[PDB]
Amino acid sequence: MSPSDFLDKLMGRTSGYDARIRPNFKGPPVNVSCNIFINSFGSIAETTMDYRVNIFLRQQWNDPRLAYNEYPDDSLDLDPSMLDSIWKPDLFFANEKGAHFHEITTDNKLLRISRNGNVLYSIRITLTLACPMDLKNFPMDVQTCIMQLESFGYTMNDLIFEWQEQGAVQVADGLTLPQFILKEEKDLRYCTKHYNTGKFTCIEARFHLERQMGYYLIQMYIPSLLIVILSWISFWINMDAAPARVGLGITTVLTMTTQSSGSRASLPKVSYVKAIDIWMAVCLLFVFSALLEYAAVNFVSRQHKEMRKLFIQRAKKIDKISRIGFPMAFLIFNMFYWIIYKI
Amino acid sequence: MSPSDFLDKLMGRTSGYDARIRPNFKGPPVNVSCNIFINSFGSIAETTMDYRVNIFLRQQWNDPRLAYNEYPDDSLDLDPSMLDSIWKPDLFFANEKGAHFHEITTDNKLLRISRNGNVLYSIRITLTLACPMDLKNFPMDVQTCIMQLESFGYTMNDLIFEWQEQGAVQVADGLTLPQFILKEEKDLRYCTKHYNTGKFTCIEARFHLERQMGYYLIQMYIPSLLIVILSWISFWINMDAAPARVGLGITTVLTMTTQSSGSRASLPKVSYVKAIDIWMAVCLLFVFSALLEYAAVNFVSRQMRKLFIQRAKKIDKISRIGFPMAFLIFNMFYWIIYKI
Amino acid sequence: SPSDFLDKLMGRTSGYDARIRPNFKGPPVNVSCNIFINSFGSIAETTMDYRVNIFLRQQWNDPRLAYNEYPDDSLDLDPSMLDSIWKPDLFFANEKGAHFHEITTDNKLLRISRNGNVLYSIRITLTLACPMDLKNFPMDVQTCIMQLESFGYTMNDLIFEWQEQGAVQVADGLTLPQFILKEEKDLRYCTKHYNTGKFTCIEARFHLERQMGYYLIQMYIPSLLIVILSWISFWINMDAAPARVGLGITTVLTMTTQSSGSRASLPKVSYVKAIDIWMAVCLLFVFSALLEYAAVNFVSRQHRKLFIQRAKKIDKISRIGFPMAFLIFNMFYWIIYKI
Amino acid sequence: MSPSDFLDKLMGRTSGYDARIRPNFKGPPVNVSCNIFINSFGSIAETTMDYRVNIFLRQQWNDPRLAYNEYPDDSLDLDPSMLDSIWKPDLFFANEKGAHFHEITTDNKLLRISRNGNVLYSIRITLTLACPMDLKNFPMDVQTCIMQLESFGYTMNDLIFEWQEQGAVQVADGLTLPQFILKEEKDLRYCTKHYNTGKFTCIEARFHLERQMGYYLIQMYIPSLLIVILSWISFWINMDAAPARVGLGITTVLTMTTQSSGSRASLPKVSYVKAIDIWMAVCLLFVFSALLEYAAVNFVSRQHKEMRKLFIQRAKKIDKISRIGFPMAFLIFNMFYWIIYKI
Amino acid sequence: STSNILNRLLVSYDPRIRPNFKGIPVDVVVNIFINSFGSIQETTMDYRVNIFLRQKWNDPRLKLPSDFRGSDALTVDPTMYKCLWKPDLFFANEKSANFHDVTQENILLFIFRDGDVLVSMRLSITLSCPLDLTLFPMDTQRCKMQLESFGYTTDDLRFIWQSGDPVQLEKIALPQFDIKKEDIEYGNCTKYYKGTGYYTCVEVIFTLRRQVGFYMMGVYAPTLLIVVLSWLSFWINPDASAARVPLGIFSVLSLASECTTLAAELPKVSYVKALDVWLIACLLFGFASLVEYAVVQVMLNVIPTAAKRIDLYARALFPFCFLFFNVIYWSIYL
Ligand SMILES: *[C@@H]1O[C@H](CO)[C@@H](O)[C@H](O)[C@H]1NC(C)=O
Ligand SMILES: *[C@@H]1O[C@H](CO)[C@@H](O)[C@H](O)[C@H]1NC(C)=O
Ligand SMILES: *[C@@H]1O[C@H](CO)[C@@H](O)[C@H](O)[C@H]1NC(C)=O
Ligand SMILES: CCCCCCCCCCC
Ligand SMILES: CCCCCCCCCCC
Ligand SMILES: CCCCCCCCCCC
Ligand SMILES: CCCCCCCCCCC
Ligand SMILES: CCCCCCCCCCC
Ligand SMILES: CCCCCCCCCCC
Ligand SMILES: CCCCCCCCCCC
Ligand SMILES: CCCCCCCCCCC
Ligand SMILES: CCCCCCCCCCC
Ligand SMILES: CCCCCCCCCCC
Ligand SMILES: CCCCCCCCCC
Ligand SMILES: CCCCCCCCC
Ligand SMILES: CCCCCCCCC
Ligand SMILES: CCCCCCCCC
Ligand SMILES: CCCCCCCCC
Ligand SMILES: CCCCCCCCC
Ligand SMILES: CCCCCCCCC
Ligand SMILES: CCCCCCCCC
Ligand SMILES: CCCCCCCCC
Ligand SMILES: CCCCCCCCC
Ligand SMILES: CCCCCCC
Ligand SMILES: CCCCCCC
Ligand SMILES: CCCCCCC
Ligand SMILES: CCCCCCC
Ligand SMILES: CCCCCC
Ligand SMILES: CCCCCC
Ligand SMILES: CCCCCC
Ligand SMILES: CCCCCC
Ligand SMILES: CCCCCC
Ligand SMILES: CCCCCC
Ligand SMILES: CCCCCC
Ligand SMILES: [Cl-]
Ligand SMILES: [Cl-]
């Protein structure tokens, strides 16, 4: 049978087939149903704003010139070396940012021709696609990263890209991700870019990404709450214990600032304010204000001995009002923060 | 007698051999026996979920078209240049994530053909495979990283992969790794992907990895116990040395805070709660509880009415033996739930 | 057929030469080249570089390639035959590394019109380099440029020129960390003068501004709070020696650890930045507060009540002196770096 | 006579020379005398367990088919472009872990053929070789990193590798390394591998490495000693200054803890305990025991009054015995540590 | 017909034969135009650099025939460059390099009537130079760019720098170094390998100095004022133990924390440095202050109470010793 000789007879020098002429030339455009299969979705970074994927991109189209009827076998597998000399859609990724094929022990390409000219073309690609990311609400952000497929030399009247009806974009088994959770739902919006030359076909898929909260929650939020509670505790000690209260306040503020330093060391480097910087700043302001109010109490107390006992009663009243003002104000701030950053 | 010319006569333009048609075409599937030889296992990162290996991948199969009888020698080595013109199985790793060959002073490939058609195809690859990591219990986890060998353009009725009878996956001499120790047992599991286009053959090997409990134990757990015992030391002092008690409590809580902060860089950058974070949070909570207990004692004692002083003494006596017992209960729950 | 029409128009059977510029030994061949920034970012202070993706395209007349027999208005081409046609030798003077894109096809395009005009659009990824001066780090404004220049042609053979309108364009609202790319971007006209003649040059300047919210909060606010805490240490009685010493030394320690933790996030540079001055001055103020407490303690103890009166007067005169000094420093620091 | 034309006549289509067959076929094994010349030894890393070198690998052997006497020139150079037409040994590195050639303005390969048939073949390579490292005694370790040269497809009876008689490995000029010093004497082990298929030739050269105790011995060690001496200073204080003693002890604890925390950034990322972790743990334990003994003496003293001054005398006795007990224990620990990690 | 003349000129030409095969050695003039001086990676001892390499020599076999005139220069394709003979020039100390291909093979070739050939190309070579990190904050580094032949001895190939302008760097703005002029000399630094004869080599030396403003303001001044604060405890009354112990111990803690945090920001090499010596000396001074307070306390605990005399001694002993050490340190390290 010799399919290679049959392939040469069907297309080649003695066939008249041209590798640079699209099927149905000077006529209707040729639709290319392309469906992807994500195999490894990871390496999401904030410094360069990109992510890496592995795709089993397979695309199909009809070629009446390649259609045959004499050969008994329906499918004719074709090697990449001869695949170099067959017409293929000029597909490219609009935000590839860098990509390469895989050629381990064999080229990772597969082309088969059906009886009625249908062609299946599946290849393995690795892409460091780029998606802009916003960190206005860092610990509780929802991120969306997309990939776009477009023609490069064919307008809307020549090449058209359409997703499959069922299972256009699939995912592998229970692959994990650090600092992210890939949403099981991934809508497939349609695309179209109207350039100056004309209309180019384009399709995109959106991968919704959630962010984990346990580690950030514990390590950052909880010690801040404990330090703020200690700063509150600084109110219950006696007024005369000046070294004790000064040490407690200043050590709480040092603990807050070293927690902030550790966070900044372990946080993504971004110049605009995130949602955890607000929390750290507010906790620092709270402990600073507690130390300031202790200083005010001490100054009020000192002038009594240097009026009789009137100033002492005033200092006690300040302590009593503060011991209930601080927790309620902090609770109001916490309620507002969690309402505004969750709802 | 001119082995190159003999091989050209055996297979080539004049012999009619085809490099795109599998042996035993439109017939029984051709078996492949491939045995891996790990040469360098390392570079395990929990950030991108990948690890790098070196492999002496050698795969054998029988090709009747390559059988010869006139040549006297039993074997016949082949240069890679003409190796580029012979049928080879398209064995691709299902999670290769990137790789490349080796071409130092010569292509690192070898192909020899026996008299009966059996051919050995040993090559050198440097894979960086990908394996998901489960870090729920970080310091005491047992990861399982695997590699998969599968065909690409052939189904189960044409190409079937299988390991050797013994010693399919082998390892080199006593190579070492940081933060891991490779298990001497590596089961050779069997896989098969039932795609819509048919059944593609699959073989996989699982490498068991256990994390060492060394540096982590000492310099992440011991200081926490020391700081908690220092907080108990703060417990062991009277209620009138207020500057001393306050300073001891605040300095212990600051020491716990800086101990937690410093280890943040060493630990992997993950966002779900690990076993180590639970321990650090519990130790910080213990220190905070000790300081709060002292605050309550001071409030009551600063609150004849010596019974209040008697009640402060009772609180101190209770907390003398309450915190150690609670810490022991926590330490007996934690290690039992995370190790057994 | 269009496929072999290219061979008929140029090639073995036509006599066209692919190594000779059009209008040979005559007027220079103008090349109207315009770029399209597709992805701007990856700016690093360690290597003084940035990375872009460019849809570089350029037109130039070619009477040799001009045709009139073929009915079709346009005539596309593939890279295989594109490798055998004259193209301008356009290279970036500060590329520092480059590579094409070859995913599923070569990312190149070439079509020829009837009049001879040729379009040539390619997709490139350039890791260009620009020197960035961080003298005023939190309030800097960078200016990074790219230089398109010929290599083997003088200005009598090849001349570049930006498009009359929309020469440099930007994609949708891409976001960078630590930088906001200004919408305005001037297009200067460089020209290098060598001993062998004049080589063509064209440049586009990308003005960059740095956001300062996170820097402002996480560095300036704690330092100001620690200074206020030092003033609180001022606002205490003289006999409270343990409390005052502890407060002063712990404020000093807090400033030191704040600076130490801040040194990791900031770029590693060897000359003084505008934030190092602020941190050093705040630390100096805390040290001066501790020194003032030491002086008042030495004067008060020492020894009639005039010495204790002198210590009280020292506290009275330093209670409001430090706030005025800090306000003056703040006003002279923000004026000199924002105006 | 053009040497290029002479070489084309000697090996070519009309020459009969086969480049795919070893010299002395079905005869004695061919010996290769290869010597390396290290040019840039460095970039040693512990995360990937590898190091990088630049080697002027030159290997000499005899090819009887290259014998010529008509040409009067003693030496006959060969252009690097036509290296495919001459038989070369398939020398490969068993633990290369990756490498590449150099092609700056010309292929960095040389080949000249002597009159009697001797062949010289010098190339420039850049190997990122890999060597396991043991860090049980980190600040005083002695690493042993090696490189292995082996044949790939040829057994022991066909290809034999032997080092040059003198100067087999020659280090370059006074190049330095970070955190290491390369010993000027290196042994030349005669490796060999015995696989099932037969014996494959193998030759290895071992490089002995010595760590420096400099920056380490200063920063990781002297501050800990100073903190311990400060703790003994805390010992030498009156028992009445309870806040002073508590503060001095807890701060020394804080200083040791932050020293241990900060030191980890520079230290290698290793799970098993090193020789410096023991020192840090012992110093922390010493400071903790100091604070514990202070707590004990304070509790004993407070038992008096709170039955005569015998309790005060007992507390004083605890101080007197601790003042001299603990420094001697520290000296004993220091002697044992340095003896066990240096002898 | 500029292709036909060069084709006929290259007919019956052997690329493997150098000009003057049995004659005098060929002379090659080398020019370098540095575009960007890459950042030095002190961890792996290397520095990238992007250069314009221009080498010119003479080839009698490339004499332009009298029938064809063209112009004073002739150009051969940067894809047909392999037809003519090119010198085997490589950088001795380099460890990683590559050409540049942005739109074309950016190699320039000129052939003149008299026979001179001009070759221009782009490179991004990552050279290597051993760096001495002793006296780290105020050191000075020198790095080489040795160009060396690989296959020809001095009897066949020779490299000489262009008399006018060997290197023409214009603007670099290094993040941690600076230079404007470099030693274009040492060009005749010839390396000889025994058993192969003299090998030609041309060497240029770049002198790199490190700016010290950040280290002077970021470490030295804070550490000095911390030492001043450590002294400050001498003037407080001896009875104020609870006020003088915290000052010294927190000064020591601040010094230790600053040293530990500055670690991993300095280059990670294991040997003594000027900054390390300064930090350890300041830590020792704080330690000595605390020990002096301990001596005062033990002396304190009719008794003569000879502790104020110890304080009087210390008040003039500590600043004087620190100033003497500082003078010695600067005089020996600067
Ligand atoms: C799909 O392609 C065919 C030609 O192959 C064309 O006739 C038809 O109009 C196209 N329809 C779509 C879906 O665009
Ligand atoms: C290009 O510009 C030159 C002047 O520099 C002019 O002489 C010429 O006619 C213009 N057109 C072309 C493409 O030659
Ligand atoms: C350089 O030194 C060599 C001798 O080793 C020789 O070429 C000559 O004396 C010197 N000058 C030049 C230009 O080569
Ligand atoms: C949060 C700071 C409070 C400062 C003290 C305010 C006192 C107000 C009442 C004065 C009679
Ligand atoms: C920022 C320090 C504030 C100290 C207290 C000031 C009180 C002023 C009002 C007194 C009646
Ligand atoms: C945001 C912190 C508020 C602390 C309490 C302030 C009380 C001020 C009024 C006292 C009479
Ligand atoms: C911070 C050093 C202080 C030294 C003592 C100064 C004394 C000044 C007053 C003298 C009458
Ligand atoms: C650095 C603060 C200095 C404050 C003034 C001190 C004056 C001391 C002498 C008083 C007679
Ligand atoms: C329009 C720019 C304004 C910059 C800030 C000016 C601040 C002036 C007051 C400083 C105390
Ligand atoms: C903290 C170091 C103590 C050293 C010994 C001091 C002894 C002082 C008394 C001498 C009679
Ligand atoms: C870890 C230090 C132990 C010091 C000795 C304590 C003795 C306690 C019992 C006294 C009767
Ligand atoms: C490489 C020369 C080292 C000389 C000795 C330096 C000693 C520094 C520490 C002094 C206390
Ligand atoms: C305490 C004196 C500090 C300055 C010493 C300067 C020494 C001379 C330096 C010359 C560059
Ligand atoms: C500009 C960011 C606003 C975040 C939500 C509101 C926070 C209120 C804090 C009191
Ligand atoms: C998802 C957050 C879980 C936090 C658990 C804290 C347990 C403390 C003992
Ligand atoms: C103490 C305030 C808690 C607020 C929780 C909000 C949860 C929203 C889903
Ligand atoms: C851990 C804190 C316990 C507080 C108990 C207070 C009892 C008051 C009667
Ligand atoms: C999966 C979460 C387990 C949390 C266990 C907490 C045990 C506390 C003693
Ligand atoms: C009190 C903790 C005991 C932990 C025992 C662990 C045993 C593991 C085999
Ligand atoms: C933050 C401003 C404080 C102003 C204090 C003024 C005191 C005057 C006696
Ligand atoms: C490190 C152990 C403590 C020193 C021994 C003596 C302790 C007092 C009996
Ligand atoms: C460790 C410093 C001791 C200084 C003693 C000075 C004695 C002066 C009489
Ligand atoms: C009374 C003045 C004593 C000064 C001693 C100076 C010692 C310098 C080493
Ligand atoms: C009342 C004294 C004011 C001093 C101001 C100094 C800047
Ligand atoms: C360029 C120098 C600026 C000094 C500012 C001092 C506040
Ligand atoms: C190698 C010599 C070590 C001596 C140690 C003395 C404590
Ligand atoms: C700042 C040093 C002052 C010394 C005073 C000695 C009387
Ligand atoms: C949104 C800005 C908050 C600043 C708090 C100090
Ligand atoms: C008296 C209660 C005041 C609360 C302010 C938030
Ligand atoms: C850790 C010691 C506890 C003692 C209780 C009596
Ligand atoms: C974006 C400006 C933030 C200011 C916070 C004080
Ligand atoms: C804390 C120690 C108590 C010892 C009682 C005998
Ligand atoms: C070079 C600047 C030095 C500044 C010292 C305060
Ligand atoms: C440290 C010196 C002490 C001298 C006692 C007379
Ligand atoms: Cl304190
Ligand atoms: Cl820190």
Numbering used by the authors:
A (entry chain C), D (entry chain A): 8 to 313, 383 to 419
B (entry chain B): 8 to 310, 383 to 419
C (entry chain D): 9 to 311, 384 to 419
E (entry chain E): 33 to 333, 443 to 475
Copy text verbatim from the article accompanying this structure deposition.
Here we report near-atomic resolution structures resolved in digitonin consistent with all principle functional states of the human α1β GlyR, which is a major Cys-loop receptor that mediates inhibitory neurotransmission in the central nervous system of adults. On the contrary, the heteromeric GlyRs containing both the α and the β subunit are found throughout the central nervous system. In all the structures determined, either with or without glycine, 4 α1 subunits and 1 β subunit were identified, consistent with the recent discovery of 4:1 α2:β stoichiometry of human α2β GlyR and heteromeric GlyR purified from porcine tissue. However, due to the distinct characteristics of the α and β subunit transmembrane domains (TMD), symmetric activation in ECD resulted in asymmetric structural rearrangements in the TMD, leading to asymmetric pore dilation that is distinct from homomeric GlyRs.
In the absence of glycine (apo state), a single conformation was resolved that corresponds to the closed states. All the orthosteric sites are empty. In our apo structure, all five binding pockets are empty and in the same apo conformation. In the apo state, 5-fold pseudosymmetry is maintained in the whole α1β GlyR, with tightly constricted ion conduction pore.
